[PDB]
Amino acid sequence: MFKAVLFDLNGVITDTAEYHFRAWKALAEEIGINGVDRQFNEQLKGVSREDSLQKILDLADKKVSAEEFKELAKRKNDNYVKMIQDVSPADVYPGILQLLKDLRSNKIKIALASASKNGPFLLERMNLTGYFDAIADPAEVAASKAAPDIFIAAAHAVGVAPSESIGLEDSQAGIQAIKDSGALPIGVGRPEDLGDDIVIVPDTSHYTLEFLKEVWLQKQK
Amino acid sequence: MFKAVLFDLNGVITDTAEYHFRAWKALAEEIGINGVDRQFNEQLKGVSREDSLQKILDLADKKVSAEEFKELAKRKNDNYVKMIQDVSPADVYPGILQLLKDLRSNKIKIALASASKNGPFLLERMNLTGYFDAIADPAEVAASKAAPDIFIAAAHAVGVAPSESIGLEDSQAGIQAIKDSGALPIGVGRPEDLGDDIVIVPDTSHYTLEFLKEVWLQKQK
Ligand SMILES: O=P(O)(O)OC[C@H]1O[C@@H](OP(=O)(O)O)[C@H](O)[C@@H](O)[C@@H]1O
Ligand SMILES: O=P(O)(O)OC[C@H]1O[C@@H](OP(=O)(O)O)[C@H](O)[C@@H](O)[C@@H]1O
Ligand SMILES: [Mg+2]
Ligand SMILES: [Mg+2]
Ligand SMILES: [Mg+2]
Ligand SMILES: [Mg+2]
Ligand SMILES: [Mg+2]
Ligand SMILES: [Mg+2]
Ligand code: NA
Numbered sequence: 001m002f003k004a005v006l007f008d009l010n011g012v013i014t015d016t017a018e019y020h021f022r023a024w025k026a027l028a029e030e031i032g033i034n035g036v037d038r039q040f041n042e043q044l045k046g047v048s049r050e051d052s053l054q055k056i057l058d059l060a061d062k063k064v065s066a067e068e069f070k071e072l073a074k075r076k077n078d079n080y081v082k083m084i085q086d087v088s089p090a091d092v093y094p095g096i097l098q099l100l101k102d103l104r105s106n107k108i109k110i111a112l113a114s115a116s117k118n119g120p121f122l123l124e125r126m127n128l129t130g131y132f133d134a135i136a137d138p139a140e141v142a143a144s145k146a147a148p149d150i151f152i153a154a155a156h157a158v159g160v161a162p163s164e165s166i167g168l169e170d171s172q173a174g175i176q177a178i179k180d181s182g183a184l185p186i187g188v189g190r191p192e193d194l195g196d197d198i199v200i201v202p203d204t205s206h207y208t209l210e211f212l213k214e215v216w217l218q219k220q221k
Numbered sequence: 222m223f224k225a226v227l228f229d230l231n232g233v234i235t236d237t238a239e240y241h242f243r244a245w246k247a248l249a250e251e252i253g254i255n256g257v258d259r260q261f262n263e264q265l266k267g268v269s270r271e272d273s274l275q276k277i278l279d280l281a282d283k284k285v286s287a288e289e290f291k292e293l294a295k296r297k298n299d300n301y302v303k304m305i306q307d308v309s310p311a312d313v314y315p316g317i318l319q320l321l322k323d324l325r326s327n328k329i330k331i332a333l334a335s336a337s338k339n340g341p342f343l344l345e346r347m348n349l350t351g352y353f354d355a356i357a358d359p360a361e362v363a364a365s366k367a368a369p370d371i372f373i374a375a376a377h378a379v380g381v382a383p384s385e386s387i388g389l390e391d392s393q394a395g396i397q398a399i400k401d402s403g404a405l406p407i408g409v410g411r412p413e414d415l416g417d418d419i420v421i422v423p424d425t426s427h428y429t430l431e432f433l434k435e436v437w438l439q440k441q442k
Contacts, residue, residue, distance in 0.1 A: 172282065195279030196272070197261075217413040218393060221260065 002216050004133075004165040005103055006154040006183060009114030010045070011170025012204060014091045014126060016118075017045060019083040024056060027076045033060040046171030048115050048143040049073050081118065087125040095205040100131040102209040109133045109158035113151045113167060115143065133158045145173040148181035155183065166212055184219055186212065223437050224385040226324055227357075227375040227404060230335035231266065232391025233425065235312045235347060237305055237339075238266060241273075244301040248293060249277050256280040267392025269336055269365035270294050302339065308346040316426040321352040323430040330354045330379035334372045334388060336364040336395075354379045366394040369402035376404065387433055390415075405440055407433065 010016055021041045028036040036056060044052045053073050057064065064072065103110050112119050112135040119138075123129045134157035142149040148162075155162045167178035170188050175198055178185035187200035188207070194200050199215050201207060231237055242262045249257040257277055265273045274294050278285065285293070324331050333340055333356040340359075344350045355378030357364075357371050364371035369383075376383045388399035391409050396419060399406035408415040409422050420436050422428060 195276075195282065197256075197264075197276045197279040220413070221263065 001213065002108065002164060002166045002184070003160040004109035004111055004155055004158050005212070006111050006113040006151050006162075006165050006167040006178070008046075008167075008169045008171070008174055009112060009116050009119050009122060012093065012168050012188060012207075013096055013112075013128070014087070014093055014122065015170075016080075016084055016087065016116075016122065017041075019080055020044070020052075023076045023080040023083060024052065026079060027072060028056055028060075031062070031072070033057075033062065035059050046115060046169075046174050047145045048138065049077060049117065051143070051145060077118075081121075084118065084122065084125070087122060089127045092126050092128065093204040095203075095207050097128075099207050099209060100128065104131055106209065109160060111154035111158045112136060113154035114138065115145070115150065145171070146176045146180070148177045148179075151178050151181040151183055155181070166216065168207060184216065186215060222434065223329065223387050223405070224381045225330035225332060225354075225376055225379050225387070226433070227332050227334040227372050227383075227386050227388040227399070229267075229388075229390045229392070229395055230333060230337055230340050230343060233314065233389050233409060234317055234333075234349070235308070235314055235343065236391075237301075237308065237337075237343065238262070240301055240304040241265065244297045244304060245273065245277060247300055248274075248297040249280075251296075252283070252293070254278070254281045254283065267336060267366065267390070267395045269359070270298060270338070272365045298339075302342075305339065305343065305346070308343055310346075310348045313347050313349065314425040316428050318349075320428050320430060321349065325352055327430060329430075330381060332375035332379045333357060334375035335359065336371065367397040367401065369398045372399050372402040372404055376402070387437065389428065405437060407436055 007013055024044060025036045033056060043055060050073055053069065100110060110131050110133050112132055115138050117138050119135055123132060136150050136154035136157055138150055141153045151167050152162055155165045162182035165183040167183040167185050169175050169178055169185060172194060175185045175187050175194065185198045187194045187198055188204055189200060228234055245265065246257045254277060264276065271294055274290065321331060331353050333353055336359050338360055341356055344353060355375065357375035357378055359371055362370040362374045372388050373383055376386045383403035386404040388404040388406050390396050390399055390406060393415050396406045396408050396415050406419045407422065408419055409425055412421055415421050
């Protein structure tokens with residue numbers, strides 16, 4: 001059986017996309033960039049902080065010094081962190097708490113494989129820390145948006161190979177990253193967005209242990 | 222007693238999966254899409270031609286016009302049709318010819334409920350057409366994945382309700398389709414693929430009239 005589930009954070013466990021967006025938008029407007037709208041923001045979902053800033057600078061044909069780049073990312077992060085102070089257990093997505101309980105009861109490892117360096121604080125705000133066996137640290141691994149390294153690290157952090165794991169993602173690039181890791185992806189979202197080459201569910205209420213096991217068994221030949 | 226048996230084609234009466242696979246892989250290579258391997262191909266079984274092409278495009282997040290999509294499906298089908306020109310009566314799966322004889326002699330209706338538009342040609346190549354009371358036409362009803370409509374149409378084409386029928390399938394989604402139609406499914410293959418809540422035989426040599434009768438009786442209580 002799969003020995004671990006590797007969880008995305010934003011779009012799976014909860015979603016703080018609106019606050020990421022608002023913080024990026026506010027930063028962009030401050031530095032004279034006006035194109036950071038919700039459509040553009042779709043290109044930032046799932047993407048590292050630094051690659052997100054780079055996409056925003058690129059949009060505006062803007063270039064800044066290394067020092068200024070760090071300052072800008074920090075400014076956005078400080079605003080984001082202010083905005084997520086009131087995240088609570090009520091923000092856990094539908095079905096997720098029960099899934100975590102069931103995985104734990106079945107001694108299946110639970111690892112966070114989020115791009116977000118704010119993951120630990122968010123899990124604490126949601127009272128989920130006790131379920132997580134490990135959190136892969138995005139500062140420690142390759143962080144391009146389709147890079148498999150965060151998923152590989154999450155599996156390894158709980159003593160298992162990606163080949164022995166399921167990964168849950170909302171991002172197209174994250175699904176590709178899971179494939180490249182060797183883990184089995186199960187996406188959450190619409191076919192129009194994620195495609196049909198992997199198993200997807202419409203929303204997290206469909207992520208049950210029974211469903212994960214059914215998919216796993218079918219996919220292991 | 223049941224009044225009809227609704228037969229899948231590929232994986233039940235014969236299997237042309239290898240030729241479907243080779244034709245899709247050739248098409249994918251022409252358009253520069255990687256990932257159409259034998260493992261991926263498992264998810265194309267019981268899927269319509271168009272839904273199969275969509276999955277392949279989705280491997281690469283490729284988008285095409287409606288005309289381009291039609292052209293690609295046509296090119297794959299042309300290649301597939303060439304590759305099945307040598308199908309013969311020796312390709313009929315084990316036990317199937319005797320089952321057809323026994324059903325006919327017991328005045329049980331026989332209908333094809335395949336997703337494949339190439340079904341009639343294949344039955345002719347195998348010298349089986351005369352055993353079939355009807356062929357449900359997957360160009361005229363929904364027939365991909367878990368669509369019950371192809372099974373409903375097959376039953377109706379021989380004057381019976383699905384509730385009066387057994388359906389035979391090798392695909393998990395096709396088993397679901399049979400269940401949703403109201404017919405009694407009997408799968409062939411792995412429980413790991415098809416489920417633990419229907420009768421499954423390991424291979425088609427187990428599909429005998431006596432066995433179908435025993436299952437029908439057992440499932441009526
Ligand atoms: O390090 P941080 O600035 O907190 O977040 C990094 C990224 O985390 C991602 O989380 P996920 O991969 O969806 O869980 C978000 O989707 C993305 O919008 C964000 O830029
Ligand atoms: O219309 P065509 O391109 O000839 O075939 C459509 C589909 O027929 C299905 O037949 P079945 O449902 O297993 O008998 C095959 O399993 C599937 O792989 C194929 O794509
Ligand atoms: Mg996400
Ligand atoms: Mg992610
Ligand atoms: Mg609140
Ligand atoms: Mg089949
Ligand atoms: Mg079928
Ligand atoms: Mg031959
Ligand atoms: Na923990």
